[PDB]
Each structure stands twice: as structure tokens, then as C-alpha cells.
């Protein structure tokens, strides 16, 4: 009877019920497809795990907004009926759209959600607004760092100021790609687990005794790249770190480090590389994270700037890096006028960062007034899909 909070994340989809404190549903957004020499897709991590011939890795969020409508429906069709199995006709829904979503995309999304799934009520909100609500604020600056799109969204009274949005592509994907390139410097082949089933006490700085699963079919370049990206991302989260000050060849370099064994067992305790890689979004022609934030705040009215300078909220899958918030605080303190008191809200755990938009959707979906502010099925009837524009800000 409760509402469903669907956060279609850049690279991981988050879903769950209105009152739940975390999304019980979560699976990578990437999906596979192949056509008759059928277009049925494969969803969820477990299905994608199985290698298959001419099976791609299609992501319906290339531009942040929904780019592949059939793929987006397929994921929504899968998630509704399998992961959060329940009839669509009975549950009201909350959808988290990107801050800069194109109007036509919103209209098409509403038309699909209503007609195809016949849901009774509906509401579309911006992920930045949901993050601000989740953190417990109506005015602030939300720095989102997901996949392929990092943006600094200033919100005033729960309304996203499109004036001050700065879109930076130095998102999590870029960092992971740099991770691939910095082990072209270590000269280690990137081999995914799905090919590797063997382990041994392989010496440090020594190629491993890895053996392949021989009978698997020839894999597509897309899914192999997708499997390598997952490997480096799992490595990325647990290894990378943001230096407190801009890296300048510390004592030996960074003193002892993590001895993170790759899927092939072998590895060398990563040195300065784990510090250089995260700085890709601090020392990039493009604009750094602090540059993005200052340009965004400097772009909006002076009166609200003190509200933003001091209410800067960080929430994004890429932001979950050690001491990232620390370096951001230092950088923004240096560039902010000293007479302004900057402050970052301590919400650094994985649940508060990654699922922040979903947490906000849960908070909004639970309010008693949510009944009046959504889009009724009757309103869809006599009022066309255009009602999504007026009923959602």
C-alpha cells in the first residue's frame, strides 16, 4: 500500500518502499541484449554474470537522463515484477530524475509510467532536491559524483537553481578509466574473474599462475570492458585515497600502503598511484571539483550564496573516497572569501552518500501530504501527460 521510491542511478538503480530507511533493491543499471539473426534483455548482477555470445552491456543513462526508452522500460519491467515483485496498478511511485532532465524526457517517462504500468499515482523529483531533503535541508549545494556525470546543483528552498548548475564529466567513470591507464604503467593485464578460476601464493611483483575457464564462449568487447570496469571499481573503492594537500612527492612517496590482492592473487602494495588517481578531478582544460563549486555558487544571487557557502552537501557514489571530503573542505576554504563560513555536512558513510537520493525519496514518499502533491490517475485522464510539468517543480 506504500509508495515505491525508484532512484534510477547513473550506474546503479536503487529501489524500495516509501518508509524503508534504505533501498532493499539495488542492481547495476547495465543490461545485456542480442537480436535475432530476441531483444529480451538480461538484468540484475546475477544474470549479467553469465557470459554469452553477442551479449552487450547497454546502459540506458548515457547522458544522465534516460536515452534508451526500451531498455529503461525493460529494467523497470524487471524490477517491478521480480526484484520488488508487486502489481504496478496498486502502488504509487516516486521517480528521481536528473537535475537537468529534458522536458520531453519527463513527459515520455510519465507517459510510459502511467500507460504501460497503469500506476495510480506518480511524482517526479530531482535527485539534488532529494539529496537536500535526505540530509535534512531545503537550501544548500549538492555535489553529485556518480558515473559519467558529476554536477554541483545549488538548491534554494527546495528548488534547483538551473542557473547555477555546472556539469562536469570527471565522474567515477573517468577515475576508474585512469585506474586502467595507471596499471598500463604497472604493466598488469586486466583479466576479469569470470575468466579466472584459480589462485596460488603468487609472489609480489610476479605474474600469477592464473588459468582460464576454457569452455566459455567468445565474449563481446562491451561486456568484457564492463567486467574489467567492475574489477577496477571494486579495486577503486577500497584502494584510492584523496591527499590532504596536493600531492608533492611525500616522504618516500606515501609511506606503507594497502596490499590489495587482485582476482589473480598477485599485486604490489600500491604506492603514490592511489593518491594520483583521485586527483584527476582536482588537477585535470576542464574544471576541478572546487572550481565547479565556486563557479556554481558564484553564478547565483549574492543573497543566497551564504546559504550555499556553509550548506554544501556531498552525495555521490564517486564521493565515497577516503579523505575526499577533507580535501574538498580545504580547497573550498582556500578559495572562499575568508569572511564566509564554509561547512560540509558529515554524511560520509556508504548508505548516506550513495543512497542519499533514495533516502530523500523515502522521506518525501512517507509524508502524509504526498497524497495531494503527486499526480493522480484522473489528472492524467483529462489532463494530458503535460501535467507532469506543473505538478512537479
Swiss-Prot record:
Q: Where is it located?
A: Nucleus
Question: SUPFAM superfamilies of this UniProt entry?
Answer: Actin-like ATPase domain (SSF53067)
Q: Which PROSITE patterns match?
A: ACTINS_2 (PS00432)
* Database matches in InterPro entries: Actin, Actin_CS, ATPase_NBD
Could you tell me the superkingdom of the organism this chain comes from?
Eukaryota
Phosphoserine PTM positions read: 59, 206
A GO-annotated cellular component: kinetochore
Quote the CDD domains the UniProt record gives.
Answer: ASKHA_NBD_Arp4_ACTL6-like
Q: Which UniProt keywords apply?
A: Acetylation, Activator, Chromatin regulator, Disease variant, DNA damage, DNA recombination, DNA repair, Growth regulation, Intellectual disability, Isopeptide bond, Neurogenesis, Nucleus, Phosphoprotein, Transcription, Transcription regulation, Ubl conjugation
Mind listing the GO biological process terms from this record? blastocyst formation; chromatin remodeling; DNA recombination; DNA repair; negative regulation of cell differentiation; nervous system development; neural retina development; positive regulation of cell differentiation
Q: What is the effect of changing residue 341 to W?
A: Found in a patient with developmental delay, speech and learning difficulties, dysmorphic features and abnormal digits; likely pathogenic
Under the heading Gene3D superfamilies, the entry gives: 3.30.420.40, Actin, Chain A, domain 2, Actin, Chain A, domain 4
**A GO molecular function for this record?**
chromatin binding
Query: What function does the entry list?
Result: Involved in transcriptional activation and repression of select genes by chromatin remodeling (alteration of DNA-nucleosome topology). Component of SWI/SNF chromatin remodeling complexes that carry out key enzymatic activities, changing chromatin structure by altering DNA-histone contacts within a nucleosome in an ATP-dependent manner. Required for maximal ATPase activity of SMARCA4/BRG1/BAF190A and for association of the SMARCA4/BRG1/BAF190A containing remodeling complex BAF with chromatin/nuclear matrix.
Disease association reads:
ACTL6A mutations have been found in patients with intellectual disability of variable severity, developmental delay, dysmorphic features and digit abnormalities. Additional features may include genitourinary and cardiac defects. The disease phenotype resembles Coffin-Siris syndrome and brachymorphism-onychodysplasia-dysphalangism syndrome.
**What family is reported?**
Belongs to the actin family.
Q: How does it assemble?
A: Component of numerous complexes with chromatin remodeling and histone acetyltransferase activity. Component of the NuA4 histone acetyltransferase complex which contains the catalytic subunit KAT5/TIP60 and the subunits EP400, TRRAP/PAF400, BRD8/SMAP, EPC1, DMAP1/DNMAP1, RUVBL1/TIP49, RUVBL2, ING3, actin, ACTL6A/BAF53A, MORF4L1/MRG15, MORF4L2/MRGX, MRGBP, YEATS4/GAS41, VPS72/YL1 and MEAF6. The NuA4 complex interacts with MYC and the adenovirus E1A protein.
Tell me what this protein is called.
Actin-like protein 6A
Organism of provenance: Homo sapiens
Recorded name of the encoding gene: ACTL6A
Amino acid at each position: 500500500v506504500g509508495a515505491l521510491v525508484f532512484d534510477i542511478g547513473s550506474y546503479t538503480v536503487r529501489a524500495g518502499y516509501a518508509g524503508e530507511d534504505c533501498p532493499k533493491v539495488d542492481f547495476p543499471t547495465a543490461i545485456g541484449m542480442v537480436v535475432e539473426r530476441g531483444p529480451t534483455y538480461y538484468i540484475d548482477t546475477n544474470a549479467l554474470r553469465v557470459p554469452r555470445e553477442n551479449m552487450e552491456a547497454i546502459s540506458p543513462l548515457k547522458n544522465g537522463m534516460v536515452e534508451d526508452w526500451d531498455s529503461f522500460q525493460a529494467i523497470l519491467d524487471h524490477t517491478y515484477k521480480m526484484h520488488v515483485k508487486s502489481e504496478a496498478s496498486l502502488h504509487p511511485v516516486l521517480m528521481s530524475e536528473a537535475p537537468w532532465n529534458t522536458r520531453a524526457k519527463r513527459e515520455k517517462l510519465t507517459e510510459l509510467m502511467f500507460e504501460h504500468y497503469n500506476i495510480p499515482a506518480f511524482f517526479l523529483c530531482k535527485t539534488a532536491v532529494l539529496t537536500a531533503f535526505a540530509n535534512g535541508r531545503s537550501t544548500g549545494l549538492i555535489l553529485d559524483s556518480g558515473a559519467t556525470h558529476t554536477t554541483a546543483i545549488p538548491v534554494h528552498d527546495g528548488y534547483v537553481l538551473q542557473q547555477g548548475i555546472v556539469k562536469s564529466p570527471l565522474a567515477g567513470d573517468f577515475i576508474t578509466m585512469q585506474c586502467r591507464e595507471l596499471f598500463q604503467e604497472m604493466n598488469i593485464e586486466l583479466v576479469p574473474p569470470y575468466m579466472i578460476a584459480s589462485k596460488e601464493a603468487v609472489r609480489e611483483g610476479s605474474p600469477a599462475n592464473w588459468k582460464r575457464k576454457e569452455k566459455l564462449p567468445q565474449v563481446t568487447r562491451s561486456w568484457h570492458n564492463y567486467m574489467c570496469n567492475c574489477v577496477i571499481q571494486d579495486f577503486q573503492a577500497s584502494v584510492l585515497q584523496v591527499s590532504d594537500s596536493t600531492y608533492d612527492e611525500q616522504v618516500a612517496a606515501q609511506m606503507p600502503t594497502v596490499h590489495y590482492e587482485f582476482p589473480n592473487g598477485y599485486n604490489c602494495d600500491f604506492g603514490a598511484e592511489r593518491l594520483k588517481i583521485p586527483e584527476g578531478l582536482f588537477d585535470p582544460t576542464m574544471l576541478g571539483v572546487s572550481h565547479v563549486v565556486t563557479t556554481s555558487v558564484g553564478m547565483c544571487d549574492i543573497d543566497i550564496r551564504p546559504g550555499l557557502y556553509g550548506s554544501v552537501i556531498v552525495a555521490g557514489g564517486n564521493t565515497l573516497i577516503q579523505s575526499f571530503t577533507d580535501r574538498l573542505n580545504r580547497e573550498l576554504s582556500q578559495k572562499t572569501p575568508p569572511s564566509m563560513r564554509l561547512k560540509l555536512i558529515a554524511n560520509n558513510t556508504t548508505v548516506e552518500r550513495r543512497f542519499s537520493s533514495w533516502i530523500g525519496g523515502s522521506i518525501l514518499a512517507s509524508l502524509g501530504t504526498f497524497q495531494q502533491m503527486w499526480i493522480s490517475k484522473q489528472e492524467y485522464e483529462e489532463g494530458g501527460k503535460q501535467c507532469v510539468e506543473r505538478k512537479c517543480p
